[PDB]
């Protein structure tokens with residue numbers, strides 16, 4: 001109802017948490033936020049507790065904390081990371097500095113499952129079903145992930161999959177660390193900064209992921225922008241004139257025009273032995289033109305997922321109000337907005 | 351190697367030999383789905399279990415091998431036994447699905463309570479058979495861990511079998527199956543007190559035994575916290591002997607923060623009952639796992655004086671579980687599993 005807090009020192013810093021959380025171990029893989037695992041005595045599960053670092057050091061930082069928290073609260077779906085709890089040890093807005101996020105301590109990512117395993121077709125079919133089911137939900141709330149990669153996908157011992165860590169990298173030129181292996185799953189139209197772009201950028205990534213799971217190899221492992229785009233045009237072929245007109249950027253259009261012609265390969269030969277339905281689906285996902293690329297909803301209806309597909313068990317998100325975006329507030333307003341979200345948090349029904 | 355046919359029930363693909371006809375989903379199973387069917391060769395209703403995603407993880411791979419080794423070893427009248435185990439794959443390369451076949455039972459113990467009112471003499475017969483089966487299971491160094499009315503079942507002859515063992519994985523709290531559903535689990539597992547011995551199974555048998563003697567369930571709990579209240583209302587708060595046995599110091603905080611309540615005499619609870627029944631329950635529903643009676647000792651209790659024959663309450667052959675210490679890859683677990691499918695010999699007649 002109104003928990004009692006207890007204090008302790010872990011990461012060379014004080015951790016003041018509800019006493020329901022116990023045995024806090026700093027099993028942390030990442031900075032810009034410190035995380036511990038703990039035993040939640042109420043639910044009787046193991047959890048991850050993330051203490052946000054310097055959440056309100058800046059307007060940019062105050063705005064990012066509010067954006068992150070608003071989204072995390074909104075996302076209630078089996079195939080999407082959810083918030084078990086959010087709390088502050090502060091009893092007042094006057095005394096408010098720390099924000100803590102609690103989620104399920106999720107298992108290994110998708111890479112750790114797929115070393116060079118070609119993965120059985122039934123296995124890939126279940127995994128990609130779940131990503132798409134999750135994307136349908138996320139896209140329905142007018143959100144685009146944009147960084148979707150195997151390390152953003154947690155998987156159970158039962159192959160139940162959740163989508164993690166949505167887009168913090170808004171638009172190419174932003175917080176892009178690792179410019180080697182990150183770009184392997186990124187849609188061309190955002191790599192090359194065309195105007196032509198929609199939610200199906202995530203679908204390109206799903207295509208790359210699915211291909212990897214079937215083949216056991218990264219599909220487009222490029223050493224840089226140039227080698228990346230070269231590997232891509234080798235498989236899908238160079239843009240038709242329909243696509244060239246829809247591009248607005250002149251540097252973008254003339255750059256592509258320079259590239260020598262390349263035919264769209266036959267995917268059945270590239271993915272030899274593979275389920276014909278899978279190959280057909282790959283062909284609908286790995287397309288250059290965003291207007292032509294298959295959406296999450298449509299992919300879900302693809303025959304490849306016949307066994308799993310049930311439109312009544314593929315929910316959409318409630319409408320998500322993003323009007324706080326492009327608003328001009330001081331850092332205190334942003335802080336107070338964040339406080340309200342912490343204070344009014346209700347756990348999801350169990 | 352017979353002919354297979356394909357089919358879809360419950361968002362899964364079923365590829366079974368032609369001899370199994372008229373499949374139909376009859377509820378769920380432990381890491382699988384179970385369909386009733388008619389065997390054309392023997393003219394017998396059979397249950398067919400499709401293992402769920404047997405080799406998609408190391409944990410599933412091992413749980414699959416464990417389950418199959420177990421069912422292959424179990425040969426007792428009060429325990430489920432394999433009639434058949436098959437795969438559609440004709441090579442280890444192609445081996446992805448595993449199917450288990452057993453006799454189709456008449457009804458579980460939820461649909462016998464529903465059915466008719468249990469005369470004390472019938473309860474004795476049913477509980478005798480559960481214990482007889484437990485003695486066998488326990489003699490192979492196996493704990494069931496999740497014994498409940500849905501995991502017990504009866505023929506037309508009131509011949510009872512134990513179904514669906516527990517998967518040996520600490521997986522405490524978090525359930526290696528479905529979310530929510532307790533009632534028959536002993537407290538020492540719910541709170542992780544100390545070293546749980548085979549008598550945790552006995553705690554379940556008592557709860558079942560009571561629910562048979564009296565229409566209502568013994569500990570109808572809402573959540574973990576509630577369940578404990580219910581359990582302590584009847585049993586009474588732990589003693590200083592137990593407090594010392596409980597190695598978890600976190601658990602101490604909770605117990606000593608609760609209100610102390612003395613032990614109820616079971617006559618008052620189970621009014622009108624057979625005194626031997628009450629007396630047996632006392633020994634089953636004790637809180638200390640050291641003094642809790644065993645399956646073997648329970649069979650000897652005077653309550654079963656009509657049924658007890660020591661020369662016909664057998665134990666299992668030596669079961670080798672040295673695999674349990676091994677850490678392998680999926681294809682190693684799979685390969686070992688494949689060897690077990692291929693080797694399998696159906697029981698005579």
Ligand SMILES: Nc1ncnc2c1ncn2[C@@H]1O[C@H](COP(=O)(O)OP(=O)(O)OP(=O)(O)O)[C@@H](O)[C@H]1O
Nearest residue numbers: 031032054055056057058059060061062064174175
């Ligand atoms: N004055 C500031 N107030 C608040 N946040 C700031 C400020 N300056 C930078 N930041 C935030 O921190 C980022 C830069 O921090 P940076 O990682 O360079 O620091 P550091 O690694 O701790 O220091 P250094 O690299 O000098 O050892 C900016 O992108 C912004 O998000």
Ligand SMILES: O=S(=O)(Nc1ccc2[nH]c(C3CCC3)nc2c1)c1ccccc1
Nearest residue numbers: 030032033052053068081164165166168
């Ligand atoms: O921890 S994550 O697994 N990965 C991650 C990667 C980059 C991140 N950048 C930030 C912002 C700095 C404070 C918030 N959080 C980040 C977290 C994670 C888990 C759940 C949701 C989101 C992220």
Ligand SMILES: O=S(=O)(Nc1ccc2[nH]c(C3CCC3)nc2c1)c1ccccc1
Nearest residue numbers: 397399450451452454455456457513514
């Ligand atoms: O032990 S099983 O995991 N489960 C099981 C077994 C027999 C059953 N017979 C019935 C009848 C339908 C109502 C009673 N259910 C049953 C459930 C199992 C099933 C198949 C092969 C191996 C193990």
